[model samples]
Target: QSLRTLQGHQSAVTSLQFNDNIVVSGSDDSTVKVWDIKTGQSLRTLQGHQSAVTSLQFNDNIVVSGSDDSTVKVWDIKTGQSLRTLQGHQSAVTSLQFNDNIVVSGSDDSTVKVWDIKTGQSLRTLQGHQSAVTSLQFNDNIVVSGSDDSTVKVWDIKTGQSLRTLQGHQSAVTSLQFNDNIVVSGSDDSTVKVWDIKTGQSLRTLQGHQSAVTSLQFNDNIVVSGSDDSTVKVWDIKTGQSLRTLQGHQSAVTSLQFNDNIVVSGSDDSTVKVWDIKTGQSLRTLQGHQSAVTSLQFNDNIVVSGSDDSTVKVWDIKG
Candidate 1:
């Protein structure tokens, strides 16, 4: 019945991830902060990169952070120690994902690098885009990446070979997600497209937002997208129909995540809003961020958010 806030970064927080009882944040302040979720306490700050920490992901005891310094740092979550630093991209490391022993990173360097997460070794550098890679996600055998080149590329992770390149938008592709055999992408082009992974085909072009689409998620039959238009839209995947638009934010939406039936969104309006996915309605507006909310992750009853205020916050929605 109450929301709790955790504070501690000195500049804009860019990305965050939560697991078990821990919440980790990456920030423009050039550091990563770990927090104790239950008590809303700062645990420790992980520092190494000399530039902004733009993205982060966690798997088990390991955490992967990407930075504008053009490197990815692997950290021991329990030990709060820097384990390894991976480099290859010539520009900013904007996004990354950790899965099945591999770390796939997107960069303004215009290429995605597949690395051995266990050894901190570069496996292969995937190239094809004419512009920077903005977001990436890997699932078992496939690696899907979005680019400022206005395209998305899918690769066979094991072969180092690109499965196919997806192109259709008029602007940069900003974010991507996958569910089952379909790949969903959000773009600065103000549209979201659903692609068939195995067939190398475009299934649907989701249109409605009046501004650039920034964040996206595919949960079961629903395709949820957050946009700079200041709205979160729900779409029917099969019918390609615009279902409902979740609104309340006064500024651009920067990120959104789905935890079971709840849709959590962060925005430049300086708030995180929780939505009822099934009802297509606004449930609660979680406020406290001093600046724009950039990213968020949900762990059980806890909703963790990062902000342009250079701080990470943990909101306990359960009590």
Candidate 2:
């Protein structure tokens, strides 16, 4: 019934991810630290990307980072040990995702490269964006990408065939997520649009946010969106109407994730909220951080959060 705190880093914690083994985090202070998932102990602080590890993700096996130095560095998720630094990305790597043997990376060069993870070899270049690619994600079949040009592209990674180019937003795409044949995108235009990859047609526009709608996730029939206006709304995908609004945070909702049942959110109020999907209940408001809570993540085993307060907090139920 107790929580844990990790302190000692000189700068604000920027990116965080944890798995069955450990938690790997990147910081504004420019170091990658691995912490024990259970004991909350700092195992080691990895240096080398003092260039600031901009992007970090892993699943207990490896932690991959993209930085301002254009270094795509890979490290052991548990030991905090360096595996290798692959060389590429002419300018800053805007975003990247590593899935075992292959790495998909986007850069300021206005290109996305599929490269061999171990050999650092570029397999093929995806070129269509007139501007830099800002966000990216791929599946076993397709790759959906977001660029600075206010456009999106979905492609067949296996066949190298163009699925369709999606363009409807007048503003740059702030966030993007895809599942099966549908893609959900939020923009600086204060709106959300649901589109189909099968035909490049926008099936419906979900308009409810008062400010820039920045983050969202959808599953089955409902889509959940968080905006700069400090509200998270759940919308009906088939009906294109809001089902319910989850409101408790006094500021903007920046991060949220849900699986089958649990819905958790982090906000500018320096708090974390766990909500009820059945009754739309804001169950818990964790308020230990003095500043805004920028990042939060969890699994069945534990939950960890990072804040502008420069502290990492952990909650667990392993017992």
For each candidate in the order shown, give its overall lDDT on alpha carbons.
Answer: 0.86, 0.79
- Weakest ten-residue segment in model 2 by summed lDDT: 310-319
Q: What TM-score does model 1 achieve against the real structure?
A: 0.94
Off by over 4 Å in 1: 1-3
Using lDDT as the measure, which candidate wins?
1
lDDT of 2 by residue, 1-319 (tens): 2277877667777778876657777777778788876777888887778576667887657778877677778887656788887676777776788787788887777777787887868777788888877788898978888877888888777665667899998787777899888999888788888999899989888988888876788998898988888888999988889888898889988878776666778888888887877789876777687787777887874668887787788865232
By TM-score, the best candidate is: 1
Alpha-carbon runs more than 4 Å astray in model 2:
158-162, 316-319
Can you give the lDDT of residue 70 in candidate 2? Answer: 76
Candidate 1 per-residue C-alpha lDDT over 1-319 given as tens digits, one digit per residue, 9 for 90 to 100: 3355667788888888888778888888899988887787888889899999988887677788999999999998878899999978899998888876788888898989999987889999998889999888888788888888998898888888988888788899988888678889888889999998888689999999999999888867788899999999989988889999998899999888875678999999999898888887888888777899888888778787878887777777654
